[PDB]
Amino acid sequence: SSSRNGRDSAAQRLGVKRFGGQVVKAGEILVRQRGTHFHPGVNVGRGGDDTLFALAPGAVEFGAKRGRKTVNIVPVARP
Amino acid sequence: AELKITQVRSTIGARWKQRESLRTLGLKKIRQSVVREDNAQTRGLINTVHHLVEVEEVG
Amino acid sequence: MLIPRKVKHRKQHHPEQRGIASGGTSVSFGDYGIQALEHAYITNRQIESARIAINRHIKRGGKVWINIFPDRPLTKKPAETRMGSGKGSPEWWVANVKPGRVLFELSYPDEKTARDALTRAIHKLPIKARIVTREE
Amino acid sequence: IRPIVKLRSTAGTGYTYVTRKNRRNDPDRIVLRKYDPVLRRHVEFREER
Amino acid sequence: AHKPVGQNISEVRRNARLRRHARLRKKVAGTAEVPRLVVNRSARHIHVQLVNDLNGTTLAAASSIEADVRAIDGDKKAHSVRVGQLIAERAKAAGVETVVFDRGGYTYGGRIAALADAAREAGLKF
RNA sequence: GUUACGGCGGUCCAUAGCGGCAGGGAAACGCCCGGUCCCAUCCCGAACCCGGAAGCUAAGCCUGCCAGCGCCGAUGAUACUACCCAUCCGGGUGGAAAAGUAGGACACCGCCGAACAC
RNA sequence: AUGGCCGAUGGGCCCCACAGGGUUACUGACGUCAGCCAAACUCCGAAUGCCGGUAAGUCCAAGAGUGCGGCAGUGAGACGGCG
RNA sequence: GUGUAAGUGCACAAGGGAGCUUGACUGCGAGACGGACAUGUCGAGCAGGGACGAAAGUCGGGACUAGUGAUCCGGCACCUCU
């Protein structure tokens, strides 16, 4: 006999790249995702592939806003 | 406040966390005894390697 | 023999034979019942034979319930074939029966004939089981 | 022959190029579309057949 | 007894206005350096606030209520230009030159547009 | 400063909702009156917009009453579980610890403004 | 997907037309009461592990880690515990 | 319902409709993801010259992820190179 299956796609390495508290530079990829399981918030932008990137430095802060899970970047105050 | 921690069993068959916890306690051999505090850190180390150590509350 | 009208997935992993049953641990339908004490895949044939054994040991009078449906497929590769070349086709339909799960229930007047019928059923069944009561 | 072909939208006022794709079963060859060229600025581009 | 069955056009208007207000407010938001000039418009009056949505606080407000503008012998658009002038000069007093206009879920035209153009004239930037 | 209050926002966006049954119209919010003007309906001045102030709080909005429906929901226990002990017991230790249930939880906070007060 | 309850729906019967009716030995959807199941179901949701930070530990040593370069070999694994 | 598989998402709409349009751009790209290598991916932001919008702002193709083929070789157009 034979199987009509056997295929699979390449793993896309989606996920969260910078978790809560992680200090990140601007443009840093925080979240690789397909939709908006994580939404963009403060100083975070959404790319064409629904990827979340920091628009400014800071520490990643995961929050909520009207039920949506959000990703925010809180500034790191210099001494 | 102080604990005497004597290694009684071996690192052979022991996992990385356990071996390195013993190192972090200062133990390298069977029947090697090290004296530490009763802090949370050494308490956690002992919780990780209780099966490899015999503990005695000093005084 | 019981069987589902359809399943979304015809080829499924084997149901995990672990854990005590969390639901169906009691009667909720009748007076006397069969409780299981082992893990097992109970099949169509077993269920129907046990139901029949009850319905023959006692006749018109009383009612029987079957609190499990065998909606879990089990495949079988053809015989005289090598390993591989795909997963087998469904052959058996089973119900994963954890201990505690009540399988059969009945309501009949005389406890004697009821318990004896349930004993016939248990002997048709592949597992160690137990008579249980709605009362306790 | 493909329905959606290369097109090669070129420019009026200088015949340099931009390329994209457009279905052949549109009833024309003339995808007049504005674009920015190098060496000039926004002008109308057409598809040289 | 009595029991009306359909939601009134007032409820429809309110909820829809709020919907489209939130719609444009997805993009628009105010700051201390660029406040949100948010409008409310009834059939009788018009109101504006300057908001810093960071703290959810108002910096300067204006309205067609107070007598200095209610006394005009003109239309609601006249009241609107006066309100724009007032909120412009009050914002200048508060230390503002640049805002972002929140039309409150209304259509930009008539009274609201006149208010906005008046504030633009008086000095605010948008 | 006080409102049965009008806006703008916030909350691990439901302890906030829905549905009650009894209420309110000071300014305001509103319905509401008309389309001459900007503007508008893939038809409609319904809407959008504009000009208005005849009457009405009927509705929206707002206030009080609530465990009726939904939502929240511990504790303890259980399941599951990392490590460990244990020659099958998936047994047991010390740690973590649900879901479901049950007991019980019914909006709050801020800024501005309005009338009044002052 | 189990049993009840209701009862559309149809099948029959009787009023016997054709419609409209009641009535049912029957099927009986939908809904509802109770009990259940799922790797490709999830209102939920652990422990662990992972990422990061931080304070310490080890610290005459783990003979650690990272970077560069020379030299490799390996790229047939096995059993056991757990999933 | 989302052009089309499934999933993640989308009702705040990314779904439905209308108007205007061509950013389905040029030069670039801080920083990142992913990573044997080669591939691949996101990208704020600066300028140019534009579209829409009152403005803020958005637009470097499409809700996202597939829809493709290294190098060699050769072809075409343009270029103040040889």
DSSP assignment of C49-83 equals HHHHHHHHHS-SSSEEEE-----EEEEEPPSS--S
List the beta bridge partners of residue E14: none
Q: Residue A12: which of A60, A49, A44, A40 has the closest Cα?
A: A49
> DSSP string of E11-65?
HHHHHHHHHHHHHHHTT----SSS-EEEEEE-SS-EEEEEEETTTTEEEEEEES-
Q: Where are the domains of chain E?
A: 27-126
Neighbours of chain A (3+ CB pairs under 8 A): C
Which helix (H) or strand (E) segment holds residue C122: the answer is helix C111-124
Q: For residue E60, give every residue at least 6 positions away whose Cβ sits within 8 Å of its Cβ, in sequence order, or none.
A: E49, E50, E87, E90, E91, E93, E94, E96
The amino acid at D44: E
Nearest CA in chain C to A5: C86
Resolution stated for this PDB structure, in Å: 2.8
For nucleotide G38, the protein residue with its alpha carbon nearest to C1' is C72
| Residues of chain C positioned with their CB less than 8 A from the CB of A1 | 78, 81, 85-86
**Residues E59 and E42: beta-carbon distance below 8 Å:** no
In angstroms, the CA A25 to CA A33 distance is 19
CA B19/CA C16 separation, integer angstroms: 35
Obtained via which technique? cryo-EM
Q: Residue holding tokens 């002992």? A: B46
Q: State how far residue A8 is from chain C, nearest Cα, in angstroms.
A: 16
Strand H footprint nucleotides (protein C-beta < 7 Å) = 7-10, 12-14, 21-27, 30-35, 41-44, 48-50, 54-57, 60-65, 77-78
**Whose structure tokens read 């039920």?**
A67
Residues on chain C bordering chain A, Cβ-to-Cβ distance under 8 angstroms: 78, 81, 85-87
Instruction: State how far the alpha carbon of D37 is from the alpha carbons of D6, D11, D29, D45, in Å.
Output: 19, 8, 21, 9
Q: Which residues pair with D17 in a beta bridge?
A: D10
Q: Which residue of chain A has the CA closest to C86?
A: A3
CB E65 within 8 A of CB E103: no
Q: Which CATH architecture is the domain E27-126 placed in?
A: 2-Layer Sandwich (3.30)
Residue D36 CB closer than 7 angstroms to strand H? yes
d(CA E77, CA C96): 76
CA atoms within 13 A on the CB side of D25: 3
- Separation in Å: G64 C1' and B59 CA: 36
